[PDB]
């Protein structure tokens, strides 16, 4: 169920500075490339060890494409200020998500090409890779414009071609890395957070990928009638952390069990205070 995606962003702030352009590439939800106009030497950069298999000519070719996207964005950004009759005084954001989904059979399943302005859906290439869906009156202008120039056939060509061809390549050089994991190291803490009541916290640390599932259960059905579960978060070193706790009557703490589900773990983890 592989996939490739390019998340591009352009933001303008008042000042003599041209808007900031950022492009992050993803292979199976894993960042592998990145370009940031705010760098001393703007060039796409390797973000996964398997990408160093690519030669200088690949990085130039991509950096040039970034260069052009940057202009396409800064230009587009200005057209939108017009469409929306907005005041040149604040800040504005233009975002794009592009890429393609593949089945494990290396077969293309779907193409993606959509844009957002100010964080709200703007215009999107439908799944038929031929027609457009425009969010508002402004988008109707872009829709008309991309229909007359036959834009879709172009992105359609990227989606069924380039996207699919290059995604096969990366998967081939990066399957080694991609399939790797880092088992979560769980444990449970005890916090006197009450009287006649206590708070148990189950922890999952240093795991990877981010996908993971934690559960509580006073032997029998599970507990969601007092379980807190923070959003998984990055450790800063490449792995992630996450926890969940539940209020328990002081003296029964040891009677609750925590189960941790991750695929780097040969089997589910069971833990008690």
């Amino acid at each position: 169920p592989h996939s490739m995606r390019y998340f591009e962003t352009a933001v303008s702030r008042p000042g003599l500075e041209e808007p900031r352009y950022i492009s992050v590439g993803y292979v199976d939800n894993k960042e592998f490339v990145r370009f940031d106009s705010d760098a001393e030497n703007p060039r796409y950069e390797p973000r996964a060890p398997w990408m160093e298999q690519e030669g200088p000519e690949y990085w130039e070719r991509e950096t040039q494409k970034a260069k052009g996207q940057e202009q396409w964005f800064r230009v587009s950004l200005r057209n939108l200020l017009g469409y929306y009759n907005q005041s040149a005084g604040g800040s504005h954001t233009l975002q794009q998500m592009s890429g393609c989904d593949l089945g494990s059979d290396w077969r293309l399943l779907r193409g993606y090409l959509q844009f957002a302005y100010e964080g709200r859906d703007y215009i999107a290439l439908n799944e038929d890779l031929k027609t457009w869906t425009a969010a508002d009156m402004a988008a109707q202008i872009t829709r008309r414009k991309w229909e007359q120039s036959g834009a879709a056939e172009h992105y359609k060509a990227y989606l069924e071609g380039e996207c699919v061809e290059w995604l096969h390549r990366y998967l081939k050089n990066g399957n080694a890395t991609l399939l790797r994991t880092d088992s979560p190291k769980a444990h449970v803490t005890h916090h006197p957070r009450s009287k006649g009541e206590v708070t148990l916290r189950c922890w999952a640390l240093g795991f990877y990928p981010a996908d993971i599932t934690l559960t509580w259960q006073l032997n029998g059905e599970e507990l969601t009638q007092d379980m807190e579960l923070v959003e998984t978060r990055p450790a800063g070193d490449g792995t992630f952390q996450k926890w969940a706790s539940v209020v328990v009557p002081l003296g029964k703490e040891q009677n609750y069990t925590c189960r941790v589900y991750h695929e780097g773990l040969p089997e589910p983890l069971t833990l008690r205070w």
């Binding site: 390019y6 492009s23 590439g25 490339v33 796409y44 991509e62 494409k65 970034a66 052009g68 996207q69 396409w72 230009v75 587009s76 057209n79 939108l80 794009q96 592009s98 090409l113 844009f115 215009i123 872009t142 414009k145 991309w146 120039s149 834009a151 172009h154 992105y155 990227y158 380039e162 996207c163 061809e165 290059w166």
Partner: peptide, 9 residues
């Protein structure tokens, strides 16, 4: 490989 946009918005 990165996409290369077509007609601006």
């Amino acid at each position: 490989s990165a996409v290369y946009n077509f007609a601006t918005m």
